[PDB]
Amino acid sequence: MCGTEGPNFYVPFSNKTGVVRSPFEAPQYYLAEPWQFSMLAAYMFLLIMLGFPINFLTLYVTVQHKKLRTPLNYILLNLAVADLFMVFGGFTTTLYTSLHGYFVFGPTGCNLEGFFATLGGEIALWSLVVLAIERYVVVCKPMSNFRFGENHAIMGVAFTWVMALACAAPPLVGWSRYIPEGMQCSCGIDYYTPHEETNNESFVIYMFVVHFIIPLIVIFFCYGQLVFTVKEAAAQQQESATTQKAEKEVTRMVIIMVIAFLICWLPYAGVAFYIFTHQGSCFGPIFMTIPAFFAKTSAVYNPVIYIMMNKQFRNCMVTTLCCGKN
């Protein structure tokens, strides 16, 4: 008797005292104090205030600078848009519901907010995967006579939308479901109840394999091969101080990206390990929901790492912010 079941929701709190209410109808102040809901709002506010400008500005300087509109950069614009889906589909709604202490948009808004917030995070995830694949193809040259062009980059972007719909759409049509999660102010995939009617167990496994294990393998293989190729070529040109510098910075960037991906990936894996083993006990509004709580900041640090640390983007944004000069 861990929580309180109901149609379209699972409140992680026991109703033996009779105080539990539907997360669509009344505040959930038995899960957390009102000030903790306010701090949830403050965190959404921080994410909006940092996440909208960085991601919008990425779209804005691309319009003003012709050099940024290369095919290899299409996937980065895709990343900016996906983060905007997280900011408006997810962070903005949650700021508003947070301050009511419950999900005031009803089960319909739950499917909407859950879809768009999940879509945004999924497009982002597969953008990092596709970018790693593209860089691997361009550097390691695994195809004899291949040249990465505009059409290939469009396939890459379309591929992320297909993968993102593959995760976000089934819960609308019967495989798993969207329900309020954690403090019940935002909606997501249901990893919290085994709903035999929506086959939740098979979807969690599909999510864990296809959208969690595979992305890590692809990112590690592609970037490992790339660093191997770059270090090999530099070894044959040790007379060039610049080639060695380029090799060092490529390696240091790949480390940063992989470390950043792990910082978002490992908390989910640690929670899994605490579900596999330690399966008995319940889990409060801090389920899990802790990996979700911190993965949200990827809408801020991913554009910082993949765009603001890009050599050309930075100069173009300085020029744009500096009213044309500098």
Ligand X SMILES: CCCCCCCCO[C@@H]1O[C@H](CO)[C@@H](O)[C@H](O)[C@H]1O
Ligand Y SMILES: *C(=O)CCCCCCCCCCCCCCC
Ligand Z SMILES: CC(C)[C@H](C(=O)N1CCC2(CC1)Oc1ccc(CCC(=O)O)cc1O2)c1ccc(Cl)cc1
Ligand U SMILES: *[C@@H]1O[C@H](CO)[C@@H](O[C@@H]2O[C@H](CO)[C@@H](O[C@@H]3O[C@H](CO[C@H]4O[C@H](CO)[C@@H](O)[C@H](O)[C@@H]4O)[C@@H](O)[C@H](O[C@H]4O[C@H](CO)[C@@H](O)[C@H](O)[C@@H]4O)[C@@H]3O)[C@H](O)[C@H]2NC(C)=O)[C@H](O)[C@H]1NC(C)=O
Question: Of residues 3, 13, 20, 44, which one binds ligand U by CB under 6 A?
Answer: 20
- Cis before 288? omega within 30: yes
| Binding piece for ligand Y, criterion CB under 6 A, among 87-95, 206-214, 217-225, 317-325 | 317-325
Angle at 316 between CA 312 and CA 317, to 5 degrees: 120
Which residue number, 286 or 318, has a Cβ lying nearer to ligand Y? 318
Question: Of residues 3, 10, 12, 22, which one binds ligand U by CB under 6 A?
Answer: 22
Question: Of residues 118, 176, 184, 186, which one binds ligand Z by CB under 6 A?
Answer: 118
| Binding piece for ligand Y, criterion CB under 6 A, among 137-145, 214-222, 275-283, 316-324 | 316-324
By CB under 6 A, tell whether 282 contacts ligand X. no
By CB under 6 A, tell whether 318 contacts ligand Y. yes
Query: What are the residues whose beta carbons fall under 8 Å from the beta carbon of 202, sequence distance 6 or more?
Result: 175
Question: Of residues 1, 7, 18, 197, which one binds ligand U by CB under 6 A?
Answer: 18
Q: Give the separation between CA 111 and CA 300, rounded to whole angstroms.
A: 25
DSSP state of 297: T
By CB under 6 A, tell whether 145 contacts ligand Y. no
By CB under 6 A, tell whether 99 contacts ligand X. yes
Question: Of residues 15, 36, 38, 193, which one binds ligand U by CB under 6 A?
Answer: 15
The reply, when asked if residue 150 is annotated as ligand binding, is: no
Question: Of residues 113, 122, 190, 247, which one binds ligand Z by CB under 6 A?
Answer: 122
Angle at 79 between CA 316 and CA 134, to 5 degrees: 90
Shortest distance in whole angstroms from residue 87 CB to ligand Z: 15
Q: How many residues bind ligand X (CB under 6 A)?
A: 43
Q: What is the 3-state secondary structure (H, E, C) of 97-163?
A: HHHHCCCCCHHHHHHHHHHHHHHHHHHHHHHHHHHHHHHHHHHHCCCCCCCCCHHHHHHHHHHHHHH
Structure tokens at 112: 């909407």
By CB under 6 A, tell whether 189 contacts ligand X. yes
* Binds 318: which of ligand X, ligand Y, ligand U, none (CB < 5-8 Å by kind): ligand Y
Q: Give the separation between CA 190 and CA 267, rounded to whole angstroms.
A: 18
Question: Of residues 43, 60, 161, 208, which one binds ligand Z by CB under 6 A?
Answer: 208
* Binds 15: which of ligand U, ligand Y, ligand Z, none (CB < 5-8 Å by kind): ligand U
How would you class 299 by CB atoms within 10 Å of its CB: exposed for 0-12, middle for 13-18, buried for 19 or more? buried
CA distances from 67 to 63, 73, 139, 316 (A): 10, 10, 20, 9
Q: Give the separation between CA 290 and CA 268, rounded to whole angstroms.
A: 8
Query: What are the residues whose beta carbons fall under 8 Å from the beta carbon of 11, sequence distance 6 or more?
Result: 3, 4, 20, 21, 23, 28, 31, 180, 184
Which residue number, 59 or 318, has a Cβ lying nearer to ligand Y? 318
Subset of 195-224 contacting ligand X (CB under 6 A) = 220, 223-224
Which residue number, 17 or 236, has a Cβ lying nearer to ligand U? 17
Subset of 249-308 contacting ligand Z (CB under 6 A) = 264-265, 268, 272, 275, 295
Q: Please provide the size of the chain in residues.
A: 326
The reply, when asked if residue 201 is annotated as ligand binding, is: yes
Q: Give the separation between CA 40 and CA 147, rounded to whole angstroms.
A: 47
CA 145 to centroid of chain Cα atoms: 34
Helices 311-321/34-64 angle, 10° precision: 90
Query: Interface with ligand X by CB under 6 A: which residues?
Result: 27, 33, 40, 90, 94-96, 99-101, 117-118, 121, 124-125, 128, 181-186, 188-189, 220, 223-224, 227, 251, 254-255, 258, 261, 264, 285-286, 289-293, 295, 298
Which residue positions form the known binding site?
Answer: 201, 279
Which residue positions form the known binding site for Zn(2+)?
Answer: 201, 279
Query: Interface with ligand U by CB under 6 A: which residues?
Result: 4, 6, 15, 18, 20-22
